[PDB]
Ligand binder design. Structure first.
Ligand SMILES: *[C@@H]1O[C@H](CO[C@@H]2O[C@@H](C)[C@@H](O)[C@@H](O)[C@@H]2O)[C@@H](O[C@@H]2O[C@H](CO)[C@@H](O)[C@H](O)[C@H]2NC(C)=O)[C@H](O)[C@H]1NC(C)=O
Ligand SMILES: CCC[C@H](N[C@@H](C)C(=O)N1[C@H](C(=O)O)C[C@@H]2CCCC[C@@H]21)C(=O)O
Ligand SMILES: *[C@@H]1O[C@H](CO)[C@@H](O)[C@H](O)[C@H]1NC(C)=O
Ligand SMILES: *[C@@H]1O[C@H](CO)[C@@H](O)[C@H](O)[C@H]1NC(C)=O
Ligand SMILES: [Cl-]
Ligand SMILES: [Zn+2]
Length: 603
């Protein structure tokens, strides 16, 4: 470790720890910057040489974290917890957690290389026979093909191509990750991930939320299953069984927006999916990002700085070059550089993804002046909810009218149901998936799910929560979890479930602050400077305060609460129940063993 980056001497008391944290912050920004910069260079240009550089940078980060971590322990182990300064305890608590820097050097290299190889396999995997990429080719097929055989070819092809080679690497990664975090005092990596919520009853609290939400999902599922049955027939759709996992518009069946045209209750009302209008009008990536920015500035939040426009990658590069297409928002930790990397396509769901990613950036802009350790959301679910809350206003027919994407205006019960059903396809359908992913991973980290049961336990959870089944046979050579970006990229997932509840709590509070006084689902906070000020206080706080207190100031309650979500969806919840009863549906999938046959000439 370069001399200028190494820790000096500090007295063993709160006054020294303040000087320590300031010296740390000088050197940390340089170290974070080089790490993020090397990751950027790799992820926008996947080559062997860029992976090598990234590995070296990660290694430097570890040397940094070890030196400053072990000094923090040496001086403040017995006493950091009793510091008067809450911000300082949070800083010292972060610096003392070494993570992968607890591993000896040879295992650090192995860990760094596994992350790099797993990333590569996911982002370069192809389906052949002339080769399709995930983004855009398979994405587009899952979205818009209504051919059972074509969808199956894409689904199976992707799961096989990405999952199978990841399996041996993921096993080695899990063992190293656990060994690392066990030296920080955690029973397993999952226990560390959960510690971010700073709640002793986190798992129970989440289970209690899911219990309230489950009926909404069961009714949506049943209604959609019926529509699919009318399309695909009795051979491929079982009205008492799980839905084949490739038919819901998305590779992971995680949001069902893309099958909106098959399930729309009242097709004579305005067409609420404005993708065809965006194409018809010649929208490009750059317009999408400008439109999102202007929402932010309408609230008197910050514009994207020059550095964002100059540095970002907003389209898939046309020179063939390999990139990580999965959308992400980047803080370089120098208070100047912030970027989005997205292989943007011109669709309505991409418009929401653009807002999601710009949400992250906005967080980074508002807390950039905090100590590095505090540059994060109050919890990870907060960071995930910011852009989604704005996108709730954007997708309102009223708002779409104002930005020229929906010519016809209507305010009637049928139009309301169409809108709420579309939003349910996006939000309610996702809930089981958001909850299940880390239940899977927590099991793997704890050792409840050994390699020999990775796929069996994955599909157990997929069926249990989503009520889907694999459309071809799977065995433990398959590693279907590995075909979802966040697993090889080691990104936690429970944040999204938290986000999907929290965003409706935020929505409710911001609407009320805006002075709006109609139905919650018709609220648009566009141009509300007051809503903007309330959101700004959250973003500026970073992780400097407990998330429960931040939530209380914002929404008036110190806990996650499903009631705002329930209220938002109330009309369609009631409608869907009524539709399902009158059609005599079975709620759930009691033929839990059922799988569809292979199509006649498959492949
Ligand atoms: C769309 O219409 C709803 C329905 O409410 C109307 O109430 C009267 C204003 C009258 O127009 C009736 O035909 C409808 O029943 C509007 O919501 C109401 O808004 C007022 C004040 O903004 C509020 O006090 C009411 O409680 C609201 N209605 C209820 C009970 O939900 C709504 O504002 C209209 N939305 C748009 C996008 O124009
Ligand atoms: C490294 C994390 C990237 C991630 N990228 C997005 C596209 C993402 O993976 N997700 C999650 C997903 O796509 O699995 C769901 C989440 C809900 C709204 C839109 C997409 C959001 C993010 O910015 O959280
Ligand atoms: C991609 O990386 C290679 C080396 O790995 C480098 O020489 C090349 O310039 C990069 N491509 C672009 C255009 O960024
Ligand atoms: C798993 O499935 C594939 C194809 O369906 C097959 O080749 C393989 O032998 C199966 N069993 C094992 C033990 O992997
Ligand atoms: Cl998380
Ligand atoms: Zn996100």
């Amino acid at each position: 470790l370069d001399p200028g980056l190494q820790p000096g001497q500090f007295s063993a008391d709160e006054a020294g720890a303040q000087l320590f944290a300031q010296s740390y912050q000088s050197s940390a920004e340089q170290v974070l910057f080089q790490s993020v910069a090397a990751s950027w260079a790799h992820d926008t240009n996947i080559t062997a040489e860029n992976a090598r550089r990234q590995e070296e940078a990660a290694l430097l980060s570890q040397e940094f974290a070890e030196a400053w971590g072990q000094k923090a322990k040496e001086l403040y182990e017995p006493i950091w917890q009793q510091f008067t300064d809450p911000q300082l305890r949070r800083i010292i608590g972060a610096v003392r957690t070494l993570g992968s820097a607890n591993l000896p050097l040879a295992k650090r290299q192995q860990y760094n290389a596994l992350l790099s190889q797993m990333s590569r396999i996911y982002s370069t995997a192809k389906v052949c026979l002339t080769c399709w990429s995930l983004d855009p080719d398979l994405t587009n097929i899952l979205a818009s093909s209504r051919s059972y055989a074509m969808l199956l070819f894409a689904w199976e092809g992707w799961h096989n191509a990405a999952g199978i080679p990841l399996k041996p690497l993921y096993e080695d990664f899990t063992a190293l990750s656990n060994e690392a975090y066990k030296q920080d005092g955690f029973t397993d990596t999952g226990a560390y991930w959960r510690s971010w919520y700073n709640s002793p009853t986190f798992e129970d609290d989440l289970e209690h939320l899911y219990q309230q939400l489950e009926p909404l999902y069961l009714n949506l599922h049943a209604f959609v299953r019926r529509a699919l049955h009318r399309r695909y027939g009795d051979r491929y759709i079982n009205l008492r069984g799980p839905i084949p996992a490739h038919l819901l518009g998305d590779m992971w069946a995680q949001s069902w927006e893309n099958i909106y045209d098959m399930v729309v209750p009242f097709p004579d009302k305005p067409n609420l999916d404005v993708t065809s209008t965006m194409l018809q009008q010649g929208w490009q990536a750059t317009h999408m990002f400008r439109v999102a920015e202007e929402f932010f500035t309408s609230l008197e939040l910050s514009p994207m700085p020059p550095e964002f426009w100059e540095g970002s990658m907003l389209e898939k590069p046309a020179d063939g070059r390999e990139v990580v297409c999965h959308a992400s928002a980047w803080d370089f930790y120098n208070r100047a550089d912030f970027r989005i990397k997205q292989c943007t396509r011109v669709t309505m769901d991409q418009l929401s993804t653009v807002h999601h990613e710009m949400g992250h950036i906005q967080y980074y802009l508002q807390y950039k002046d905090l100590p590095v350790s505090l540059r994060r959301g109050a919890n990870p679910g907060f960071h995930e909810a910011i852009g989604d809350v704005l996108a709730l206003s954007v997708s309102t027919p009223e708002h779409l009218h104002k930005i020229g994407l929906l010519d016809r205006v209507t305010n009637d019960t049928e139009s309301d149901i169409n809108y709420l059903l579309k939003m349910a396809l996006e939000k309610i359908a996702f809930l089981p998936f958001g909850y299940l992913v880390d239940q899977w991973r927590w099991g793997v980290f704890s050792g409840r799910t050994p390699p020999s049961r990775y796929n069996f336990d994955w599909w157990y959870l997929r069926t249990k929560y989503q009520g889907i089944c694999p459309p071809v046979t799977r065995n433990e050579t398959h590693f279907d979890a590995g075909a979802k970006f966040h697993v090889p990229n080691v990104t936690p997932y429970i944040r999204y479930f938290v986000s999907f509840v929290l965003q409706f709590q935020f929505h409710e509070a911001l609407c009320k602050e805006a002075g709006y006084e109609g139905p919650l689902h018709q609220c648009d906070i566009y141009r509300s400077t007051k809503a903007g000020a309330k959101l700004r206080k959250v973003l500026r706080a970073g992780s400097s305060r407990p998330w429960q207190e931040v939530l209380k100031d914002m929404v008036g309650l110190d806990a996650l609460d499903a009631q705002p979500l329930l209220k938002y969806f109330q009309l369609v919840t009631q409608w869907l129940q009524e539709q399902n009863q009158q059609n005599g549906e079975v709620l759930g999938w009691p033929e839990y063993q059922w799988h569809p046959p292979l199509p006649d000439n498959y492949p």
